[PDB]
Amino acid sequence: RLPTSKI
Amino acid sequence: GPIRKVLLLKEDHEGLGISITGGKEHGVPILISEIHPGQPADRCGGLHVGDAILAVNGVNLRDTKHKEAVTILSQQRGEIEFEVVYV
């Protein structure tokens, strides 16, 4: 439900 | 826990080595959900899964949306100072 971003 | 200041060193060919989740539009801080092995966040020793990122290089992140935080974080280069707290 929450977005995840690889950075 | 206490608010901490943490230094991270990276070269231009690398990412930060973290995954983040959360953001203002979800009512959640910018949280570290992954530290990738061997990448700059792992190597600096002071950043951990569950840390909230309060600021980077003096740019406040407490009230930023997810994609806003991604742009701000991915713009930083070299010697990068983080303000973080584990709750």
- Here the CATH number for the domain that contains residue B31 is 2.30.42.10
Question: Quick count: other Cβ atoms within 10 Å of Cβ B41?
Answer: 25
Task: Give one word for B74, left, alpha or beta, with left for phi > 0 and alpha for psi -120 to 50.
Answer: alpha
Q: Do A2 and B73 touch (CB under 8 A)?
A: no
Please answer whether residues B30 and B1 qualify as being in contact, where contact means their C-beta atoms are separated by less than 8 angstroms.
Answer: no
Report the distance separating Cα B4 and Cα B42, nearest Å: 16
**B11: helix, strand or coil:** coil
| Structure-solving method | X-ray
Show the domain range for B30. Answer: 3-86
Q: Does B35 touch chain A (CB under 8 A)?
A: no
Report the distance separating Cα B38 and Cα B25, nearest Å: 31
Q: How many domains, chain B?
A: 1
Any idea which residue has 């995840």 for tokens? A4
Report the distance separating Cα B65 and Cα B14, nearest Å: 24
Nearest to B28 among A2, A5, A6 (CB): A2
